[PDB]
Amino acid sequence: SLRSDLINALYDENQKYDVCGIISAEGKIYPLGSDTKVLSTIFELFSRPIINKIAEKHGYIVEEPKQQNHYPDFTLYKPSEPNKKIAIDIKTTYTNKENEKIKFTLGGYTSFIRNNTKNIVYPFDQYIAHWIIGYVYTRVATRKSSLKTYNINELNEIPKPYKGVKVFLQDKWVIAGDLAGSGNTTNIGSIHAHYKDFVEGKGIFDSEDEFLDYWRNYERTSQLRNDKYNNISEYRNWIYRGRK
Amino acid sequence: SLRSDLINALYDENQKYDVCGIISAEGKIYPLGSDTKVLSTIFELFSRPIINKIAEKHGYIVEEPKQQNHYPDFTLYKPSEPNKKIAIDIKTTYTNKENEKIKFTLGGYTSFIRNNTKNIVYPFDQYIAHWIIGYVYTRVATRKSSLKTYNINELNEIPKPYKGVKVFLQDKWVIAGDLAGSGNTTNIGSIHAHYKDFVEGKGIFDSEDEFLDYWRNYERTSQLRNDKYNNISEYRNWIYRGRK
DNA sequence: AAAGAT
DNA sequence: AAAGAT
DNA sequence: ATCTT
DNA sequence: ATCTTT
Ligand SMILES: [Lu+3]
Ligand SMILES: [Lu+3]
Ligand SMILES: [Lu+3]
Ligand SMILES: [Lu+3]
Ligand code: NA
Ligand code: NA
Ligand code: NA
Ligand code: NA
């Protein structure tokens, strides 16, 4: 399928290619820094041509948002199935050592998920799947050799700001957690877990509907979540009692 | 001076080189997107070797943050005078057409300006200068960006995600405005003006004392602000009333 | 402009 | 974690 | 768009 | 870090 080929292609591109700098038209190379502002951006750009190649092979069109305030990174659809669009967002986080627990911020809980046309490229009800492409890297300290420019003959000498990048493709609902990933920007938190649990989809929600209902009714502050629900056990109790 | 050499060197590097891609150790190149998320990252990496070069010509150590949500991007200081540090932060915005007005977000008003050690690499009182390197790019209307990869001999084929770019170096206070640059993330708004106003330093504040005190005592919302001040004239009136 | 999206 | 930093 | 104690 | 929308 689209999905299985996508993951295989991402997995393979990650294994074979190590991003190492920004190149100019004139050939001068600027090294990367070792923070997530840099790498998230690099990992998205890395993923774009792979996503397009595989979508194209399976007859899907690809659209990126036209404005910067819109989910998702990529909308995939067949002309024949305009109400089965697939949303793909690329998310990145890091570890300080391999096999530590990780978490992602999975986007707002107050935009498209509570209002079908808010901050989203197409109406939310035209997507039948929402996939996360998750990148995890081990952070590496900045050496002095990062502070210089390089030439193309030097490509393999450029120090890389990461070790052991790993990638996964999983449904948003499946890796979603029950605690906010950010406060003042109201983001859904993923599970906090090892990489494999993301791959295998060892999440907390039982269905995509539960995921949606949890995040559609999650209050913004502890203050408010104290008398309603703060986590999944509490939400199940709130549901049991009649949503009160 | 350090300042004058750095601005010359930034003007020159910007004239000479046009970043166009992410390159891998193995020689494959991934194209850039044309939004500010991509470009602000790229412009910061682009400025990094130049900053280090010029700082080294003047005897200044450069440090970047270890923590990822600490200001500033670059900390300069001679080791003999550690209490005379210089903060350099890189900011990016876009225009549609050349020589419309632009504005930047210039960082938090509720962090280190109100608490000497919060979200800052060194305590705020050890810095004697706060410089903004501003990048303004003209957005290139190909929002059907390029969705293939290139080899080192096709560098010339790689679409660039800007129509032009200009750069300035100015003190933060000088270009600071009186209106928040963002809401939930509580940023200082720059002036809303043409690029030459930023280069020429045509601001609104009478002094860096005025700028600091203004942003130190600015309230977070309209309702709160409406009893205090919403702009620089009301701030001056607030000053006349006894800071009340 | 102010507030809340990415 | 929550809340508020970049 | 993600990070921080 | 910055955008777009009230
Ligand atoms: Lu994205
Ligand atoms: Lu920066
Ligand atoms: Lu930075
Ligand atoms: Lu910055
Ligand atoms: Na790799
Ligand atoms: Na949000
Ligand atoms: Na250039
Ligand atoms: Na802030």
Q: What is the DSSP string of A141-164?
A: ---GGGGS-B-GGGGGGSPPSEEE
Please tell me which of the candidates A20, A37, A149 has its beta carbon nearest to residue B24: A20
Please state, as a whole number, how many other Cβ atoms lie within 10 Å of the Cβ of residue A5.
14
> What is the spatial distance between Cα A61 and Cα A173, in angstroms, rounded to a whole number?
24
Block residue for tokens 């009800």: A125
Domain A1-244 is found in CATH 3.40.1160.10: no
Tell me how the structure was determined. Answer: X-ray
B21 neighbors B15 (Cβ within 8 angstroms): no
Which bases on strand D have an atom closer than 7 Å to a protein beta carbon? Answer: 1-6
The radius of gyration computed from the CA coordinates of chain A, to the nearest angstrom, equals 20
Six token digits for residue A146: 């990062």
Q: C-alpha distances in angstroms, B15 versus A24, B12, B29, B166, B174?
A: 12, 5, 22, 9, 25
Q: Residue B92: CB partners within 8 Å, gap ≥ 6?
A: B36, B39, B40, B43, B104, B134, B135, B136, B137
Three-state DSSP at B87 gives strand
Catalytically annotated residue among A85, A89, A166, A178: A89
Six token digits for residue B236: 């001056």
Please tell me which of the candidates A26, A42, A148 has its beta carbon nearest to residue B22: A42
Six token digits for residue A239: 């549901």
Identify the burial level of A3 via C-beta atoms within 10 angstroms of its C-beta, where 0-12 means exposed, 13-18 middle and 19 or more buried: middle
- In terms of residues, how long is chain B? 244
Residue B148 contacts A where some CB pair is shorter than 8 Å: yes
Block residue for tokens 């449904």: A171
Pairing verdict, β A19-24 and A176-182: unpaired
Q: C-alpha distances in angstroms, A175 versus A113, A211, B121?
A: 16, 10, 34
Nearest CA to A58 out of A15, A13, A123, A4 is that of A4
> What is the spatial distance between Cα B219 and Cα B230, in angstroms, rounded to a whole number?
8
- List chain A residues with CB under 8 Å of B19: 22-24, 30
Give one DSSP letter per residue of B2-44, joined into a string: HHHHHHHHHHHHHHH--EEEEEETTS-EEEPPSSHHHHHHHHH
Going by the annotation, the residues of the binding site of B for Mg(2+) are 44, 73, 89
- List chain A residues with CB under 8 Å of B187: none
> What is the spatial distance between Cα B86 and Cα B71, in angstroms, rounded to a whole number?
12
Residue A82 contacts B where some CB pair is shorter than 8 Å: no
Q: Do A27 and B155 touch (CB under 8 A)?
A: yes
Block residue for tokens 């280190």: B112
Which nt sits closest to A65, CA to C1'? C6
> In angstroms, what is the resolution?
2.0
Identify the DSSP state of A184. T
- List chain A residues with CB under 8 Å of B149: 49
A89 catalytic residue (yes or no): yes
Block residue for tokens 């001040």: B229
Helix (H) or strand (E) holding B20: strand B19-24
Pairing verdict, β B61-63 and B85-95: unpaired
A73 catalytic residue (yes or no): yes
> What is the spatial distance between Cα B81 and Cα A43, in angstroms, rounded to a whole number?
40
The radius of gyration computed from the CA coordinates of chain B, to the nearest angstrom, equals 20
Q: Where are the alpha helices (DSSP H) in chain A?
A: 2-16, 36-57, 172-175, 195-200, 208-216, 222-225, 232-240
Three-state DSSP at A29 gives strand
Start-to-end CA span in chain A (Å): 43
Please tell me which of the candidates B18, B45, B152 has its beta carbon nearest to residue A33: B45
Q: Do A152 and B156 touch (CB under 8 A)?
A: no
Which bases on strand F have an atom closer than 7 Å to a protein beta carbon? Answer: 1-5
Domain boundaries, chain A: 1-244
Nearest CA to A199 out of A175, A176, A181 is that of A175
